[PDB]
Amino acid sequence: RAATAGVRISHPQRLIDPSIQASKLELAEFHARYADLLLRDLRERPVSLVRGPDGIGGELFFQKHAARLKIPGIVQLDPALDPGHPPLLQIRSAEALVGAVQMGSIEFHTWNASLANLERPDRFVLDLDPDPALPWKRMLEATQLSLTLLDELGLRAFLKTSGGKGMHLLVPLERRHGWDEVKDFAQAISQHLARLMPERFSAVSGPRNRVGKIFVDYLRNSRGASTVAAYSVRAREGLPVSVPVFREELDSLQGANQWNLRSLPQRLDELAGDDPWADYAGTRQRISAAMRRQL
């Protein structure tokens, strides 16, 4: 089990994705090999799991809580953090990560807060969700326009493909605001973009509210909500990976799912050390009165 973080994988040959002949064992090995990358996000944050016991051709279980865990190493958080439910979950090691895969996990989504203080988010996320019939170039322009606004606000943002159909923007914040304050700020950004360019942006959820447009989704900033971890896999055809990218290579992208679990190695080799999110951990910013004035 040297390639699976010491974890025994049952039914190693069952297929997670028949389209590319990706087995459960392959998925487990990917998580062992890149555990450190995924842990850059998962290590100190509560995590929600997307489990697919029958692969992507079957259905998916979105799990936040668990009473009994068969994942050696997985941490069960204090029930007081979410009364009336079994413990929340936290993965802090490769063993726990691979163990989750052994138990059917395909996706890992994290909270916008870390164990240091789960009542003060350390980031907010903006997910640009497009109409399933909108040209990719539209998402490209929408991303640039969103980044320009963030720059004017004086906020450093970190971009990554979603592995699905849109782009994700992570904005770190000092732990000086409550959940509501941060979510409302994110919503204010969405609404601002919607008022400036209503033909491009929407600040209201629901497909019928973004026909031929892009919804600047701020709802993942609700306490308990979560966002796909950078470098993690999506339970979709081709097993796409969510990949951090440089703003300078944004217009060179052709989709939000160009990279997958097998092409990630090529991506890492091409970068050869270059880290799109090199300045993430060192970023120190907070919500200011000036930012609220601009919005």
Swiss-Prot record:
Resulting phenotype, residue 129 to A/E/N: Loss of templated DNA synthesis (in Pol domain)
Effect of residue 168 to A: Loss of templated DNA synthesis (in Pol domain)
Residues noted as binding Mn(2+) 3 in the record, renumbered to the chain: 127, 129
Resulting phenotype, residue 62 to A: Nearly complete loss of templated dNTP or rNTP addition (in Pol domain)
Coiled-coil blocks: none
Binding site for Mn(2+) 4: 127, 217
Superkingdom of the source species: Bacteria
Impact after mutating residue 127 to A/N: Loss of templated DNA synthesis (in Pol domain)
Subunit structure: Monomer. Interacts with Ku.
Entry domain remark: The N-terminal 3'-phosphoesterase domain (PE) has 3'-ribonuclease and 3'-phosphatase activities.
Note from the entry: LigD has variable architecture; domain order can be permutated, domains can be independently encoded, while some bacteria lack the 3'-phosphoesterase domain entirely.
Protein name: Multifunctional non-homologous end joining protein LigD
Provenance organism: Pseudomonas aeruginosa (strain ATCC 15692 / DSM 22644 / CIP 104116 / JCM 14847 / LMG 12228 / 1C / PRS 101 / PAO1)
Biological classification of the source: Bacteria, Pseudomonadati, Pseudomonadota, Gammaproteobacteria, Pseudomonadales
Gene from which the chain derives: ligD
Residues of the full protein shown: 543 to 837 of 840
